[PDB]
């Protein structure tokens, strides 16, 4: 008699446990759909901020050299920033390179915040706009 009563309680528990799993599965799927919408909203909001950021404050255009913020600040397209090392060893070219890296650092720092990407390296824009960086520090 006691085993039968336990068996009845177990049958109830099985259907009860089955229902609890089914409810969670649908709820998870729904929260996944809402999350998908949230990610799309975040992506669209980010895309708007990024296009605005790069259209109003830090315009990026292929001017070779590539300009940032405006055609007045450009970096060599090949990435050879030896002009800074050459100037440190020596319309100053050093100001153009230093300014491009400053605006680039600000853009990178802003892009990191908007994209919510933890940058692998901690870099402040003031490092490129402070004292003339040594070859090692610049590299």
């Amino acid at each position: 008699q006691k085993l039968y009563s336990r068996a009845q309680r177990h049958q109830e528990k099985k259907e009860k446990i089955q229902r609890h799993n089914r409810k969670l599965g649908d709820l998870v799927e729904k929260k996944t759909i809402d999350l998908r919408s949230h990610y799309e909203r975040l992506a669209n909001l980010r895309r708007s901020h990024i296009l605005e950021l790069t259209s109003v404050i830090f315009p990026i255009e292929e001017v070779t050299s590539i300009s940032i913020t405006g055609p007045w600040i450009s970096l060599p397209n090949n990435g050879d920033y030896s002009a800074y090392y050459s100037w440190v060893e020596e319309s100053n070219p050093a100001y153009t390179i230093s300014a491009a890296l400053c605006y680039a650092t600000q853009l990178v720092n802003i892009l990191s915040h908007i994209l919510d990407v933890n940058l692998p390296k901690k870099l402040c824009n003031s490092e490129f706009c402070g004292e003339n960086l040594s070859k090692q520090k610049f590299t």
Binding site: K31, L35, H38, Y39, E52, L53, I57, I110, H113
Partner: peptide, 24 residues
């Protein structure tokens, strides 16, 4: 649920974040 809260925090943060305020 933790992702929704996180996403909402980022969404709400971006809604209050103005591109100008972020730059200056």
């Amino acid at each position: 649920e933790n992702q929704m809260r996180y996403a909402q925090t980022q969404l709400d943060k971006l809604k209050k974040t103005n591109v100008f305020n972020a730059t200056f």
